[PDB]
């Protein structure tokens, strides 16, 4: 129904400052409280969307090209509005995507379209966007090192926290 759907207090890609999120038929725009550049995403590059709880709630947007847009700070009540937006405007189902909370460190590391996902019994424990990765190295058998540059390529999401992610190592049998 509405022309614009607006949502307040939303963080874009681990932004330190929240901003205003506006949804329209032709795509989405985010504008920071004062300091920073506005972000835009055309409807033609909206391929999918996931809804889950994060450091409030997060809408993760999957581009038709390889990439992820993270919008968190939504309230739980915001789901039904968002689901209508993505379905009616973006031809997309907003998938409810629960993450694993058991605290296990074994499962499956899967290389998807835009992210390296570690799944625990088919539910994601965490996701690493390819755009954040500085290097991928064989560290032995059967070990792969995924390195970040929080401080060439820069890993902004790795450095958004006070505790900056430097490296993750996976044991993956059968590539040695």
């Amino acid at each position: 129904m509405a022309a614009i759907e607006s949502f307040d207090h939303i963080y874009l890609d681990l932004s330190k400052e929240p901003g205003k999120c506006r949804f329209a038929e032709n795509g989405l725009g985010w504008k920071p409280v004062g300091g920073g550049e506005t972000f835009t995403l055309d409807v033609s590059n909206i391929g999918g969307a996931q809804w889950s709880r994060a450091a409030g709630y997060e809408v993760k947007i999957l581009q038709r090209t390889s990439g992820v847009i993270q919008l968190d700070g939504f309230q739980q009540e915001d789901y039904e509005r968002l689901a209508k937006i993505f379905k009616n405007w973006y031809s997309t189902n907003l998938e409810n995507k629960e993450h694993s909370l058991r605290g296990w460190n074994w499962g499956k590391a899967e290389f998807g379209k835009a992210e390296l996902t570690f799944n625990v019994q088919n539910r994601p424990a965490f996701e690493i966007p390819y755009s954040e990765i500085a290097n991928t190295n064989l560290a032995g058998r059967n070990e792969i090192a995924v390195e970040f540059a929080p401080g060439q390529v820069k890993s902004k999401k790795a450095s958004a926290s006070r505790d900056q992610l430097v490296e993750i190592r996976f044991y993956i049998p059968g590539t040695t």
């Binding site: 994060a54 450091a55 058991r102 999401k157």
Partner: peptide, 30 residues
């Protein structure tokens, strides 16, 4: 957890690590 920092939860035998905007639990037995 909302501060995107490392959190020790001795209560639940668990540490919570901030990975790409997400608080990820790891049990001590791991």
């Amino acid at each position: 957890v909302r501060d995107m920092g490392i959190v020790i939860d001795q209560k639940n035998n668990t540490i919570v690590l901030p990975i790409m905007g997400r608080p990820v639990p790891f049990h001590i037995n791991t």
